[PDB]
Write an enzyme that holds these catalytic residues in place. Structure first.
Site, mmCIF file in Angstrom:
data_model
loop_
_atom_site.group_PDB
_atom_site.id
_atom_site.type_symbol
_atom_site.label_atom_id
_atom_site.label_comp_id
_atom_site.label_asym_id
_atom_site.label_seq_id
_atom_site.Cartn_x
_atom_site.Cartn_y
_atom_site.Cartn_z
ATOM 1 N N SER A 145 0.854 -1.206 0.000
ATOM 2 C CA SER A 145 0.000 0.000 0.000
ATOM 3 C C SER A 145 0.886 1.250 0.000
ATOM 4 O O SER A 145 1.707 1.390 -0.901
ATOM 5 C CB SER A 145 -1.047 -0.131 1.106
ATOM 6 O OG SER A 145 -2.109 0.824 0.922
ATOM 7 N N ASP A 253 -8.033 -2.849 -7.421
ATOM 8 C CA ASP A 253 -7.601 -2.633 -6.047
ATOM 9 C C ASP A 253 -8.636 -1.814 -5.260
ATOM 10 O O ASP A 253 -9.135 -0.794 -5.750
ATOM 11 C CB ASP A 253 -6.228 -1.947 -6.077
ATOM 12 C CG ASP A 253 -5.607 -1.830 -4.722
ATOM 13 O OD1 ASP A 253 -4.742 -2.639 -4.332
ATOM 14 O OD2 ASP A 253 -5.977 -0.882 -4.014
ATOM 15 N N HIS A 298 -6.845 -5.847 -1.513
ATOM 16 C CA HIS A 298 -5.872 -4.806 -1.182
ATOM 17 C C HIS A 298 -4.754 -5.449 -0.376
ATOM 18 O O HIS A 298 -5.022 -6.005 0.687
ATOM 19 C CB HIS A 298 -6.538 -3.678 -0.348
ATOM 20 C CG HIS A 298 -5.649 -2.495 -0.147
ATOM 21 N ND1 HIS A 298 -5.078 -1.830 -1.204
ATOM 22 C CD2 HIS A 298 -5.207 -1.879 0.977
ATOM 23 C CE1 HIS A 298 -4.326 -0.842 -0.745
ATOM 24 N NE2 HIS A 298 -4.381 -0.854 0.570
HETATM 25 C C1 GRV Z 1 -0.922 5.758 -0.201
HETATM 26 C C2 GRV Z 1 -2.415 5.405 -0.030
HETATM 27 N N1 GRV Z 1 -2.956 4.650 0.943
HETATM 28 C C3 GRV Z 1 -4.319 4.558 0.750
HETATM 29 C C4 GRV Z 1 -5.345 3.878 1.495
HETATM 30 C C5 GRV Z 1 -6.679 3.982 1.078
HETATM 31 C C6 GRV Z 1 -6.962 4.740 -0.063
HETATM 32 C C7 GRV Z 1 -5.931 5.389 -0.744
HETATM 33 N N2 GRV Z 1 -4.643 5.260 -0.307
HETATM 34 C C8 GRV Z 1 -3.514 5.814 -0.808
HETATM 35 C C9 GRV Z 1 -3.451 6.710 -2.049
HETATM 36 O O1 GRV Z 1 -4.349 7.470 -2.293
HETATM 37 N N3 GRV Z 1 -2.234 6.623 -2.890
HETATM 38 C C10 GRV Z 1 -2.147 7.431 -4.130
HETATM 39 C C11 GRV Z 1 -0.674 7.737 -4.501
HETATM 40 C C12 GRV Z 1 0.207 8.048 -3.277
HETATM 41 C C13 GRV Z 1 -0.007 6.689 -5.350
#
Ligand code: GRV
Ligand code: NAG
Length: 352
Positions: A145, A253, A298
């Site tokens: 993540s 995802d 995820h």
């Molecule tokens: C880093 C991250 N954790 C989560 C957990 C839940 C939803 C979104 N994200 C993200 C997100 O929006 N990354 C976009 C980008 C940095 C590649």
């Protein structure tokens, strides 16, 4: 169990100024080192960081960390659970910087929080070189993540650090799990007025300024001042990297769907989901080391049942083993595995 060490350089801190750290389980008979980056969203201004400090404090502070953690999935030392690297030296680096591992800022008279993710990784590597990493043949920087995006942002800097310190024989590689996002058209749209409504392009652009965030040099030179947010998107930063990087990404995802404002499916949403899978497959077409199943999930690499999912009959631990052999095509040992079917759970091995 992996055991906690707080950094000896106590100027390298979690968000609230407490020392950052790492959990280690040594394997004396091995020259392989796995350094894993934890994930867990991020925060990008005072008000949302304050909220995160009340109810996600282990992701902002080391004060309440336990002395040990159990290794799971790719961090397990049992071959039954980890067919790939069960005999390696194992390191788990907790995510306590809330900055996608990009920050280079200290807490001060002007900053309520420290954002030190990029410096935490460099300091862990430095302290491990005195605990046996100096003898390594392979250093695999892995993460899930936000930690998977962190691999993409930091793998070449680890490579450069070790070369400058006099260790050019250590081979640095990356494994990015669930960190390959698209800056795609969203299913429903809101202007960026608060945390819930702010799309990733806008939230990351603000975060970089709040964190003093840093991105890989070749990607920074392409996009230039004010456009560094582009380097947080895997398909834009990956072609700029020199270290070998294996990309693990579910085609549907759950975090991607969340940022796309997606939660009996009618035609508009059906076409939206199928187009997402096609666009993700497109971005991976020319990534030679990759594992991308057609599932709604995820993360995977630190899950105990990570051995169960397969693409074209090959499991993820087998693909990573085939990657190792390729870095010494291979008959029956593939390294590029991307599903072609167009709907979540069209692969029968998807997590239930
Ligand atoms: C880093 C991250 N954790 C989560 C957990 C839940 C939803 C979104 N994200 C993200 C997100 O929006 N990354 C976009 C980008 C940095 C590649
Ligand atoms: C401690 O870390 C900071 C931030 O990376 C660095 O500037 C400093 O030189 C380090 N101190 C020592 C003694 O390594």
């Amino acid at each position: 169990d992996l055991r906690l060490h707080l950094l000896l350089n106590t100027s390298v801190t979690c968000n609230d100024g407490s020392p950052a750290g790492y959990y280690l389980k040594e394997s004396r008979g091995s020259r392989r080192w796995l350094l894993f980056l934890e994930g867990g969203w991020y925060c990008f201004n005072r008000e949302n960081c304050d909220s995160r400090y009340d109810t996600m404090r282990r992701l902002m502070s080391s004060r309440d960390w336990p002395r040990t953690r159990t290794g799971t999935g790719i961090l397990s030392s049992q071959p039954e659970e980890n067919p790939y690297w069960w005999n390696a030296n194992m390191v788990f680096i907790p995510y306590c910087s809330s900055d996608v591992w990009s920050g280079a800022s200290s807490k001060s008279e002007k900053n309520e929080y420290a954002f030190m993710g990029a410096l935490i990784i460099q300091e862990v590597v430095r302290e491990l070189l005195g605990r046996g990493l100096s003898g390594a043949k392979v250093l695999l920087l892995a993460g899930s993540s936000a930690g998977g995006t962190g691999v993409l942002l930091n793998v070449d800097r680890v490579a450069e650090q070790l070369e400058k310190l006099g260790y050019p024989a250590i081979q640095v590689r990356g494994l990015a799990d669930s960190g390959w996002f698209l800056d795609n058209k969203q299913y429903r749209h809101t202007d960026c007025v608060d945390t819930i409504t702010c799309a990733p392009t806008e939230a990351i652009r603000r975060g970089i300024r709040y964190w003093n965030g840093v991105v890989p040099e070749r990607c920074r030179r392409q996009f230039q001042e004010g456009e560094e947010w582009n380097c947080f998107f895997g398909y834009k930063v990956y072609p700029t990297l020199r270290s070998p990087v294996f990309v693990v990404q579910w085609l549907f995802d759950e975090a991607q769907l969340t940022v796309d404002n997606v939660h009996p499916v009618q035609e508009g949403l059906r076409l939206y989901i199928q187009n997402l899978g096609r666009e993700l497959r497109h971005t991976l077409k020319d990534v030679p080391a990759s594992f991308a199943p057609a599932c709604l999930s995820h993360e995977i690499i630190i899950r105990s049942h990570w051995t169960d999912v397969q693409v074209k009959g090959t499991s993820l631990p087998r693909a990573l083993h085939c990657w190792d052999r390729s870095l010494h095509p291979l008959k029956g040992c593939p390294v590029h595995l991307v599903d072609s079917c167009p709907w979540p759970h069209c692969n029968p091995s998807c997590p239930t």
